[PDB]
Design a protein around this ligand. Structure first.
Ligand SMILES: Nc1ncnc2c1ncn2[C@@H]1O[C@H](CSCC[C@H](N)C(=O)O)[C@@H](O)[C@H]1O
Ligand SMILES: [K+]
Length: 218
């Protein structure tokens, strides 16, 4: 049958208002709530995401995992003129839906969808995409890659003192190794935010981990 993804875009195109990102977000959440797709209702985590963007005003954000574009719309709508969101998405069909979602929102010029695996694309950011360092990273892709890709971002020199990592679903289904690393490391200052998931009626969470610069070479 029809994929969740194509149905979410259909619902937006039929119910939301073009060039009104808030209406796009609300339509996605309304539809996903009706379908009882707990991991696709974004308003609770969105409150936390919005507060991060508003506080830190990042000029260059990297997102890992786009899906249908909800979080890309959520973040891009709060970015300044001339700021940039890069979003990495391994599934071309999801990249395609995300692109269409952004076009409907009117936010396509602020976002570049990078089609590929994070582990393959991250080492290309410096030279192929002319990145210095990222201001913010939103981790929302394959859970077992949160820690490896954080280490990869570090090694490739893409983090600076002050870079804000924000990781979703750190409790459900969980990213315990990622949490133990950033919480235990002097290179990250961490804050935890509770975020409810409907139907499962569980308190998931997001972790904010602000990079402090590398550990001493000695
Ligand atoms: N290694 C990887 N690199 C890039 N994208 C990946 C990946 N592993 C999984 N993904 C993608 O990560 C996504 C997770 S769902 C992302 C949800 C989205 N951030 C939102 O808030 O709506 C899926 O679309 C999946 O295809
Ligand atoms: K720490």
């Amino acid at each position: 049958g029809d994929t969740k993804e194509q149905r979410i875009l259909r619902y937006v195109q039929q119910n939301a208002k073009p060039g009104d990102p808030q209406s796009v977000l609300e339509a996605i959440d309304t539809y996903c709530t009706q379908k009882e797709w707990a991991m696709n209702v974004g308003d609770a985590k969105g409150q936390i995401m919005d507060a991060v963007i508003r506080e830190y005003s990042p000029s260059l954000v990297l997102e890992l995992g786009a899906y249908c574009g909800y979080s890309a719309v959520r973040m891009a709508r709060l970015l300044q003129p001339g700021a940039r969101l890069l979003t990495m998405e391994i599934n071309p069909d999801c990249a395609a839906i995300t692109q269409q979602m952004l076009n409907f929102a009117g936010l396509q010029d602020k976002v570049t969808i990078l089609n590929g695996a994070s582990q393959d694309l991250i080492p290309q950011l410096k030279k192929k995409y002319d990145v210095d360092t990222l201001d913010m990273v939103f981790l929302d892709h394959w859970k077992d890659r949160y820690l490896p890709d954080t280490l990869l971002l570090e090694k490739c020199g893409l983090l600076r003192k002050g870079t804000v990592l924000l990781a979703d679903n750190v409790i459900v289904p969980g990213t315990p190794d990622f949490l133990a690393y950033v919480r235990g490391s002097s290179s990250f200052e961490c804050t935890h935010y509770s975020s409810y998931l409907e139907y499962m009626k569980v308190v998931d969470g997001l972790e904010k981990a602000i990079y402090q610069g590398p550990s001493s070479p000695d």
